[PDB]
Amino acid sequence: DRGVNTFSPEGRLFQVEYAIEAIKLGSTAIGIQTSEGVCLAVEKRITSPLMEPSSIEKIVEIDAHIGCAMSGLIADAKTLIDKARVETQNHWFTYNETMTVESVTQAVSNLALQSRPFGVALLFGGVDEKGPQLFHMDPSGTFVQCDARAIGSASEGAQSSLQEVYHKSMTLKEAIKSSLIILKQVMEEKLNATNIELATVQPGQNFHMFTKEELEEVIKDI
């Protein structure tokens, strides 16, 4: 019914079926986990030119070896990303090593529903001893390992396209172009560098911004 805790008469409590469909109002984001690394592509969707593009960010580095892409209420995603950073730093401080992306996703999932549930979906991606990994976490405190995931308003179409354009033995160079051509097909405008953000994951590199308006070398090919 309307109660955040009461179950539905059929099978599954409501108001969490309502929180999950908040990536619908959220913006599109796609991530590919390849053997080379993890490619995280989002779109900023600036509404007015006066707003600084640097201000609007959907991808934030939780740590040097974990990057996260939000899709939904950026307000709730700020809290979730802050908790992810705090948990990663606490684990590193306790055990003097790099917390696994799976463990970070598990902690975020534990904190997701414990207050009305958070209405954001995160795409965690980072390197670990088990190679590069990517996880799709969902507002209803549920996380799943994924290799090529899409999320946002057009999650269905983007995921369907990714399902047939992805192959198990791809590299970063093909992954970025596939994600960008998909994004261009999903969005309304073109994939200008001021509107598209990209995040790369490397086994021997920290996850930095994609070349910062010198990334046109990856959109001119598109």
Binding site: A154, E156, G157, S160
Partner: protein, 88 residues
């Protein structure tokens, strides 16, 4: 007796519904309509008829009555309206 049901079109059902609907209009089957059939999971036969309806409306909007070889425009209008049905 004999309670039966369906209303669950799979890929083969959806593409056959595409074929019978494409029997109408000025379309032909050289279009890769299997791609759109994959793109809509369980889109009834009602929405397939709507999608063929939309493809006709896009052809007249372009003012080209041709639709046998108008396949790229067929695919474009079908995909954009599938986007709008899912999210408008």
């Amino acid at each position: 007796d004999r309670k039966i049901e369906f209303s669950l079109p799979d890929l083969e059902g959806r593409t056959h519904i595409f074929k019978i609907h494409a029997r109408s209009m000025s379309v032909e089957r050289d279009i890769r309509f299997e791609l759109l059939a994959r793109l809509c999971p369980n889109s009834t036969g009602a929405e397939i008829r709507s999608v063929c309806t939309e493809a006709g409306m896009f052809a007249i909007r372009a003012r080209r009555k041709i639709a046998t070889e108008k396949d790229f425009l067929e695919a474009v209008n079908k995909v954009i309206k599938s986007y709008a049905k899912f999210s408008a």
